[PDB]
Design a protein around this nucleic acid. Structure first.
Length: 87
DNA sequence: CAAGGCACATGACAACGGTGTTCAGTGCCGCGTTGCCCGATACCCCCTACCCGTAGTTGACTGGCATCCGGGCGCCGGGTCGCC
């Protein structure tokens, strides 16, 4: 069957979740939060940049600028060795 | 031989030297924080092409199918008709 949850894949996904969440915890609180909402780690629906700029109280271009800032920071080789292997 | 008079240096005396802080103000020059501008993207419309369901088609045409055996083995249990 195809509907079976392969234990190896499920456990790898859980480990990826934990490692990624730790990596965001390395980032600043606001930066980690905004990138999380932009990619919906907390909830299955990611929020657009303007969509993030309502609960947090930032403007769509301001939140956009920090989204660019988050993507850069997670792109430095520091917080990249761990997540390269998980793909 | 002892007392009184002049040289140089001396206990303090402030005020400059030079340099380190101070609160102070104002910028200097990098991050941001936000108004635009567009650009793309979801979402209404019209058109017809094709999928899918319904309804006919009148010479006559009137009862089917091939089963199934070489288990094997025994028991249960009920039915089933003879029995006297």
């Amino acid at each position: 069957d195809s509907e079976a949850v392969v234990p190896a894949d499920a456990v790898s996904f859980t480990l990826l979740q934990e490692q990624l969440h730790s990596v965001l915890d390395t980032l600043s609180e606001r930066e980690a939060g905004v990138v999380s909402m932009r990619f919906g780690l907390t909830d299955g629906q990611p929020k657009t940049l303007d969509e993030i700029g309502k609960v947090y109280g930032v403007t769509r271009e301001r939140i956009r600028q920090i989204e660019s800032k988050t993507m850069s920071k997670l792109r430095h080789p520091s917080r990249s060795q761990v997540l390269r292997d998980y793909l």
